[PDB]
Amino acid sequence: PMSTGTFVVSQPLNYRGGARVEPADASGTEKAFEPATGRVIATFTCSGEKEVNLAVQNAKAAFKIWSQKSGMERCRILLEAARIIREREDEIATMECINNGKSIFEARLDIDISWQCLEYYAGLAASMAGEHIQLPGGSFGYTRREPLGVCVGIGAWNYPFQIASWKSAPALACGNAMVFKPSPFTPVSALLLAEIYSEAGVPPGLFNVVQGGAATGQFLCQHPDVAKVSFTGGKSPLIIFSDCDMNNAVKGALMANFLTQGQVCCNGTRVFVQKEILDKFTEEVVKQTQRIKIGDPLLEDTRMGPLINRPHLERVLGFVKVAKEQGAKVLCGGDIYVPEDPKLKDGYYMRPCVLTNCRDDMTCVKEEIFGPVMSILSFDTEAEVLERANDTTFGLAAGVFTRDIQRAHRVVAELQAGTCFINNYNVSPVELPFGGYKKSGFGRENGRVTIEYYSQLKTVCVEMGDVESAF
Amino acid sequence: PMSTGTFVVSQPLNYRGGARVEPADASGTEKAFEPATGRVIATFTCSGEKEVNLAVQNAKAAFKIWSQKSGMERCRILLEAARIIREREDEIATMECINNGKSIFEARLDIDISWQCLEYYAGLAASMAGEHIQLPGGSFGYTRREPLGVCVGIGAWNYPFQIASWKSAPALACGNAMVFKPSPFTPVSALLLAEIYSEAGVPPGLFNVVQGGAATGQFLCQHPDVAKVSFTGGKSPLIIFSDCDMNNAVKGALMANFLTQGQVCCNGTRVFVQKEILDKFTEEVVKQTQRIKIGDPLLEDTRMGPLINRPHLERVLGFVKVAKEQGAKVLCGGDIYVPEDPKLKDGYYMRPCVLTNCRDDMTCVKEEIFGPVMSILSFDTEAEVLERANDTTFGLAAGVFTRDIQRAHRVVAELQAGTCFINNYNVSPVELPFGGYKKSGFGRENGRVTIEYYSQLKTVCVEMGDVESAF
Amino acid sequence: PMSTGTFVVSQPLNYRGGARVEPADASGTEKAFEPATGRVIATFTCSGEKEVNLAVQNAKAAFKIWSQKSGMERCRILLEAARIIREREDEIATMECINNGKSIFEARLDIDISWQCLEYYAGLAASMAGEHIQLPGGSFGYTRREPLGVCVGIGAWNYPFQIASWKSAPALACGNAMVFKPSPFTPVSALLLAEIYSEAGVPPGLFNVVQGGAATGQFLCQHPDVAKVSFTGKSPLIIFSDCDMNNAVKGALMANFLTQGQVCCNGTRVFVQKEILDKFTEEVVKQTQRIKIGDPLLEDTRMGPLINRPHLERVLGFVKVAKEQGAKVLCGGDIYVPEDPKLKDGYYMRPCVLTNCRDDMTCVKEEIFGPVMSILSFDTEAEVLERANDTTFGLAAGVFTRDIQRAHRVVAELQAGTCFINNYNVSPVELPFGGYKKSGFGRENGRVTIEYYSQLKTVCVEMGDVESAF
Amino acid sequence: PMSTGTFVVSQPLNYRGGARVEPADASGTEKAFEPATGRVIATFTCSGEKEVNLAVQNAKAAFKIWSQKSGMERCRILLEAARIIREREDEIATMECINNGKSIFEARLDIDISWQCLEYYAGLAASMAGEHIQLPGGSFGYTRREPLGVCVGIGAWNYPFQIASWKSAPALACGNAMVFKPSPFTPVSALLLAEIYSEAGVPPGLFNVVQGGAATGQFLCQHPDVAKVSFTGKSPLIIFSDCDMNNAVKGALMANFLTQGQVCCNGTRVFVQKEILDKFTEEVVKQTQRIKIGDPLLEDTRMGPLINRPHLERVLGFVKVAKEQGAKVLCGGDIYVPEDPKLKDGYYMRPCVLTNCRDDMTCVKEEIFGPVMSILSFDTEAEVLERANDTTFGLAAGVFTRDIQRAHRVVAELQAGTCFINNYNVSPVELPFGGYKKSGFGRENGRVTIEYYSQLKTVCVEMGDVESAF
Ligand code: NA
Ligand code: NA
Ligand code: NA
Ligand code: NA
Ligand code: NA
Ligand code: NA
Ligand code: NA
Ligand code: NA
């Protein structure tokens, strides 16, 4: 029943002891917006030192209770929380859309990964085991993974609910308590998560939320009772050879640039296209790009909502202005989009941008824009691309499009990108294993590695026989 | 054939490109000693920036070759190096003793763990596997662990050859190159390892050694081509209840305090002893402590060699002086030990020390001495000890002596110590799993976790079908 | 709302294509009972060859659909079935009690393990991964675990619902279809499971149920389209004189009289050290005489009836032979007549405690499958380990002592696959860590049972050229 | 220094208590040959019941010592045996060649896998760990893998030293003892392994060797002290017209003519797409006719003789029946007489390539176990899949096409457990990732073979008090 241009936060945005609270202390005052309308949905207080201390002391007490619960008990509560998220999916997706501006289409996908994450770690909480080892004469050594205590999770504005689920689910599955600090741009959706954990049966204090910016974050990092803080060259390339399947390359290109309004570092923004198919690819992309439905994020047919805020939209438009000054040819977009609905008129919209005649020395090719901007760079040979494209960090992604798999695997072996795609490109958070595919699963390793980030190995040795003295 | 009071370094102490070299640049000049005699075994140059750059550039080139070798090929060379260490064990142990001062007894034990470590990781190099996952429509995702590049290992003086093996074996098993910086106190034994890797068949540059202190270490940390650097409340308690087996507790106590001349952080120095058995335990400990054979570390019967250096010896003798000022009762030792052999006259020896009438406010109970000093503190009940002993950090060890296992497991559950011992106490480096027991093995987790420290997960997705466009 | 002495099966007991069906052919006719009343709850037909063929052909078709579903999709449906079991727990526990006779207390515990099992394997279905390996020149090898096809589950009467969930959850999590054959003694509770899987969203045919005995079982084993069939001295308890008396007595009673002592794993041979023999024997008889025998649907009942009249007759026969052989019956070992007249024809007997037992006595040698405790006196640690170690690996053992060196020494010496120190849990063989409550399954158990219901498929991709030896 | 036409066994062929022995009992008398010459290298006695009993009793005693050794100690001994195999590689490869007939080229490859296998399991022996689990109130459960006891290895003639290593290395790494029964065709090379284990430091009895056939094998299976016995449409190759010709031809020859095509693994049914039939058939015949047939000890030999005269006669019989049934012999299928007169009575034949092959022909239906390639023409992807999906899981398949969508589609459709894309490796079933050179074993293969040679022991420690239901 919740629609665009109506929502106003009517409750406090901090969460401690199983209840929404006003911060005890201030480190600022921020405004959260509905990017679709440009309306202020909340004027909230940034948490000070005393408030951060209260949230950590509260989490410490909940940790002491929760860490004493068995794996199977923590699993039951996390599986209930996953069922509550699934039942309230649309309500959560709606609230995510209002504050962030992504399409209800993409918000539902984030909520799915959110409850999937919770079930995965709940499963791991229930099945965890340490090692048992035999020592001579009946003596034995055994290991167990223990939680750390109070963990802090830092939020980002591009995947608010998802980052919050993805940080808290493993931390909590381990036996830890979490103090979460959302991005001051997106304070709202993390409270839905806090409320849902409480409903599922987590002890009061286990998942706390303190709102704030840099000063709040610093108070959390510096807090002596905080065990751990979980934070959030060239840019991600997309290579399109002339032997590729045109339609799939065009579809991949648009998916790699214009999903989440292109406000992701995952995005395959540098689109290296082979000289022979340049013209055909460029024309088909512009054609498919001009068809992208820009509008109200709550509408089922919207595939492009607004940019997070007004300063962010101005920055993206600034990059387009500098691009054409530097010699780029704007094919479509890169300008303010005006919707027909007068309730969306002060909303932060723009037309998706496709740039041709791009060079490696251009700032639009060098810098990550965080907007719907595609840079098309022409290339001649496999050797040339790999030279221009291998200045990419491991933390980034890459995609290759070719029908010949020998070429594909050769290019994937050469590129320094941690996540590679062959004849596809998925835009998904870094933390997601197997490039964030739908019917993929998490595998086993990802959870093992993230479980050990939120825990410590305790070792016990039992001497059965007598002590062998060196003296 | 190598004996005490004769060895002098006659070759350069840096190692690059499969050969011993003089540093190209200086950041100081250090003296390495034979602690048994107080003789200077080497006057060496500390590596400067240009020298660190040469060693890293050389490691970079070796990395490029080695990382391209298969797991099975890296395994063959690491198993051959383990065979060479095992064949040259006594020569290595002797050279370790001359520079460090530990007994040939303890040096052999370190060399054993060293070649055991190399076999373990060689086995893991050969059997490594990533994950394969099925995606809908014949599509698939897969992972692989790749090396980082040039890894740096920082050495310590207490386990010179052991720390160099333990850091390099996993790093190299992964496909990395290592630049190793030994402690300026112990430069010599790491060159034996460098030489052995070369003999085994590692490419020139794969295991480099640069000598130096803090400035050398800083140059290594700051080097832009260095992928990763591997570094190194109350103190480790030992609880002795009155229901324990006396002889085993006394043996454990002496092992926990006087092995490696008590120059280890993991040593169980705070010895909480229950009021009823205090007198009998104290007397038996002093009796067994006064029997400890102090002398030339090359002698098979020596169980106590000299302290690393004269400044270190002076510091320990200073702690004993402050302890008796604060109210401690010295039972035995804590003074200069003079050997009968005139070649050991200027060596850094002291008698193992046993202190009674100790309190929790005394600096000898609060501070880590790094010498053979045992603090005996009387206690009344299980509740009292656990209060006085739970100011211990996770990174530390603990030991409990009692015949009742319910008490033992209760105390082990309550203590914050990462490594716990029941009716025993092993003094072993932190990195060692299952408290560094002899016929223990490393299990599976330890290697998995250490591999993951020296590598990164590369993910590849292959789209078999068509791209599903949201637009 | 379901109570004792009222239930009658009013629907067919076979299940195929998402519906209860009458078998297409016969291999017999069995009677299922309510052991608390002795009433016939069902007269059912044992499945013949044609019926077994129909159930397998149906499972084959469902397998083809289900095996094509992703891990995550199979997980969703198995987690829903676990939620349905949990919501209907009391209804399932009640129906289990009526047909089997165990206490509502113990039935709830079995149902808990049943939905816990489903969640575990659902989790593993979602997170399964094969291995990826690099070969020279960009070439690579990879593995995947594939289902087998039509798997058969064979049921037992002592844990009807538990066995059905325990065999079907992993088989189904793998991508297989199952044809389940319950024990002809307990046909009823497996249909609740069949119905629940259907409700959860399994395709019709994925979990079929054919009723029958040995002939039905043989038809299933011999069926050419069946990929795999998953089938269904004695366990000692050593009580040293340095043990904690109350804990040993509690452990003894738990190890003998739970599930009416009808489990094979039960610690029936109770070796007790000579010094505490008398005190231990007296305290045990005292606690045993206090065991609440009655209607299993009652919350305070800890002992219901024995499964059958021929089964009850057999246990009573062992007691008769025991006292003939020289045993001294302290309490029980005779027909129990409850207060409630609706329980008058129920298969009830008082729990038995036997003293003055010897190793040559048939009650100490043979497995009774009733509430019978044999107390054997012993002198030393060396003696027990001689008399007691003639136990096979598939059995359990328990040791009671305050000294852990003795405990671990005894546990190291005994050939028993599952050992207990200062406790004794009575739980199915298949349950890891001796079937403890807040234990979990660990990781290995599931990996091993996943392996039983699947096969490793290997694929090698050559990137470069073929290296010819010729 | 060892050459063809000279070797004679001069010692007994049984091995017990760290020494070569004559069997105490007889179940037959077999002759072992040098297939390259037709010479008798040994006339040996097949072990009877009493001899099998002695070897098992001896293994039982060694088991008791070895099982008590730590993982690290068993690892040391197995790493020393791998080093001894590696140092004596050529001597072992030579002795393997003399008795079996494979090329020194292929024998070295088998010896490599043999010492690689030993190192792998030695590594696993050193790093083994069970599970540790927390239970409420400080209580805990733990697991450990224990050896079984006396394990029996059954040998095959096609990979003598390899099978002996592959069965013994894991069995021994677990803490077991092994009684090994080689194929009566190849008794010799397993004694080199027995002798090498002894030299490495295994206790006398740990690796015993009893020679014999079926009656010996039956005595081993029936022996009450034996814990476990480890025993030993056809594999298609699909060549589409969009494949790389040279790689397909190379793959075809590798898949048919390695190990004289005497493996069950071999991709003998060669389905070739109608457009490339003629070009492929002619290129195959060309490369087949240039395969170097001769003395297996020569470095350039790629084809030796067949294991024995009866096997050679069987293969020649298949060729005779093939041309009767309508096949067109392009090359081979007949007695080969080498240039060397010492190879005169050797079991040689020229490698065979058959065209005009139909599905109803016995050469396409039956496994030949000789160098015989059947070329069957096909029209479409749908046709091959129907004609080729009659292949069991235990078999292999290979597909040659430049389009990977087709390749993965065909690999998904085929029931073969091991599939190859644009390659075909001929390697023993037990080998993971299709037996590639710089592959490694991965982790799962060893975990699964460890489980086969061991049993899980579970121990529960109650820290608190016993929770009584009564
Ligand atoms: Na609100
Ligand atoms: Na609310
Ligand atoms: Na961000
Ligand atoms: Na020197
Ligand atoms: Na080792
Ligand atoms: Na050092
Ligand atoms: Na030298
Ligand atoms: Na070097």
Numbering used by the authors:
A (entry chain C), B (entry chain D): 0 to 231, 256 to 494
C (entry chain B), D (entry chain A): 0 to 231, 257 to 494
Extract from the study:
Aldehyde dehydrogenases (ALDHs) catalyze the NAD(P)+-dependent irreversible oxidation of aliphatic and aromatic aldehydes. Human ALDH9A1 is a cytosolic tetrameric enzyme of ∼216 kDa that was first purified from the liver and characterized as a 4-aminobutyraldehyde (ABAL) dehydrogenase (ABALDH, E.C. 1.2.1.19). The enzyme is involved in the carnitine synthesis pathway comprising three other enzymes: trimethyl lysine dioxygenase, 3-hydroxy-N-trimethyllysine aldolase and γ-butyrobetaine (TMABA) dioxygenase. In the present study, using kinetic assays and affinity measurements, we showed that among various available aminoaldehydes, ALDH9A1 preferentially oxidizes TMABAL with the highest rates at very low saturating micromolar concentrations.
Co-crystallization with 50 mM NAD+ with or without 10 mM TMABA product resulted into different crystal forms. However, the three solved structures from P21212, P21, and C2 space groups at 2.5, 2.9, and 2.3 Å, respectively, reveal an ALDH9A1 apoform in the absence of a bound NAD+ or TMABA. The asymmetric units of the P21212 and P21 structures contain two similar tetramers (dimer-of-dimers) and that of C2 only one. All monomers are very similar to each other with an RMSD up to 0.24 Å. Each monomer displays the classical ALDH fold consisting of a catalytic domain (residues 258–448) with the catalytic Cys288, a coenzyme binding domain (residues 1–127, 146–257, 470–478), and an oligomerization domain (residues 128–145 and 479–494), which wraps over the groove between the catalytic and coenzyme domains of the other monomer forming the dimer. The αβE region is not visible in the electron density maps thus is highly mobile. The first one concerns the αβE region, which is composed of the α-helix E and β-strand E, located at the dimer interface. This region interacts with the bound NAD+ when present in ALDH structures, and the absence of a bound NAD+ in the HsALDH9A1 structure is in agreement with this largely disordered region. In our three HsALDH9A1 structures, the inter-domain linker adopts a unique fold, never observed so far, preventing the binding of any substrate. The same fold of the inter-domain linker in the three crystal forms suggests that this linker exhibits such conformation in the apoform. Therefore, a switch corresponding to a rearrangement up to 30 Å must occur for substrate binding followed by NAD+ binding.
